[PDB]
Write a protein that binds this ligand. Structure first.
Ligand SMILES: Cc1cc(Cl)ccc1OCCCC(=O)NO
Ligand SMILES: [K+]
Ligand SMILES: [K+]
Ligand SMILES: [Zn+2]
Length: 361
């Protein structure tokens, strides 16, 4: 009955070893531990993904290339490697560990071990079947969804990262077995450039992709209003049997991305709404580039999952000195404008409502 927490010291070390910002996984776990939340979860060591498991989504050619350059290359550009996804030593084992962790969480859900399974180091939603993209070498979210398909006939993917979950959406673009829902910043020039409200999927999957384009400066109340409106309609139209939820913390006030203006409490309300469906739910991380705030956020959301109220004071622990200048759990929104016009937002919601009328289970 208690949530599964995917964790080992070795796994955290691997996640941080080639993370864009060092020590993020270690800081997230360290804060969860400082609040003693791990004592209220079932700690499960991740299994590393086998080649065959990774190939449920990724092509053999891409996987073999990743494996080769990871060992100590003219093809690497073809596979999306070189810039934001460097071809450095060890990336294949790294990626296989995160993929395996998400698959392990999914397997726990299939086996009925728990109703919620957490991999805060997963959520790499941009990777394509045959190329790295947007810091993502492997798409662990797709791998988790495909593991859940061994049991569940309809899976809802909900992506609350600042960025469009394009890799996951594209993986399931042509099918009605998986509905993808992404709330994200959408503005010409802003990565990855896709996911306008008119993006609804293709072929047999038409209307089984939902995209909510949002502008800079959104705060908790308006975001939750949008999220609840969409998820209410989605739940009613699609009747999912399991959920995968990406909770990238790069929406949170104080992130270097400096785009949305959320706090973990607003994201938490979204999470609570999904949890009250009482479905098998796979919880993932994602972006998040202010280390202390990302730990604040995912620790608070772990508390939400556990139904616990955490002390506002950051406990004494290894990374306490990183939590200045205030040393509290709460995050204060930045003093900058909300650029979301309410009639634009309502227009987007109206479109989505119209699209979901076509969804016929
Ligand atoms: C910030 C950034 C810089 C470069 Cl050079 C290329 C891509 C970038 O953004 C990727 C954002 C990754 C993310 O958080 N996705 O959810
Ligand atoms: K998103
Ligand atoms: K779909
Ligand atoms: Zn992101």
């Amino acid at each position: 009955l208690v949530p599964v927490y995917i964790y080992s010291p070795e796994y955290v070390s691997m996640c941080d070893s080639l993370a864009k910002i060092p020590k993020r996984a270690e800081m997230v776990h360290s804060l969860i531990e400082a609040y003693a939340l791990h004592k209220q979860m079932r700690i499960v060591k991740p299994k590393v993904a086998s080649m065959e498991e990774m190939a449920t989504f990724h092509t053999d050619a891409y996987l073999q290339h990743l494996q080769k350059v990871s060992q100590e290359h003219p093809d690497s550009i073809e596979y999306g490697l070189g810039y934001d996804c460097p071809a450095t030593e060890g990336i294949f084992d790294y990626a296989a560990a995160i993929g395996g962790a998400t698959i392990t969480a999914a397997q726990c859900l299939i086996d009925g071990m728990c109703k919620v399974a957490i991999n805060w180091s997963g959520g790499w939603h941009h990777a394509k079947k045959d190329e790295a993209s947007g810091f993502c070498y492997l798409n662990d979210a797709v791998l988790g969804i495909l593991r859940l398909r061994r049991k569940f006939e309809r899976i809802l993917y909900v992506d609350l990262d600042l960025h469009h979950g394009d890799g996951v959406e594209d993986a399931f673009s042509f099918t009605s077995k998986v509905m993808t829902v992404s709330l994200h910043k959408f503005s010409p020039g802003f990565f990855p450039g896709t996911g306008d409200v008119s993006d609804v999927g293709l072929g047999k999957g038409r209307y089984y992709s939902v995209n909510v384009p949002i502008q800079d400066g959104i705060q908790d109340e308006k975001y939750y209003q949008i999220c609840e409106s969409v998820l209410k309609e989605v739940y009613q139209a699609f009747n999912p049997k399991a959920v995968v939820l990406q909770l990238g913390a790069d929406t949170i006030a104080g992130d270097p991305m400096c785009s949305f203006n959320m706090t973990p409490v607003g994201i938490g309300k979204c999470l609570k709404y999904i949890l009250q469906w009482q479905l098998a739910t796979l919880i993932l991380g994602g972006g998040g580039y202010n280390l202390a705030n990302t730990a604040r956020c995912w620790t608070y959301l772990t508390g939400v999952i556990l139904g616990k109220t955490l002390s506002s004071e950051i406990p004494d622990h290894e990374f306490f000195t990183a939590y200045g200048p205030d040393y509290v759990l709460e995050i204060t929104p930045s003093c900058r404008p909300d650029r979301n016009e309410p009639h634009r937002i309502q227009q987007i919601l109206n479109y989505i409502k119209g699209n979901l009328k076509h969804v016929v289970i």
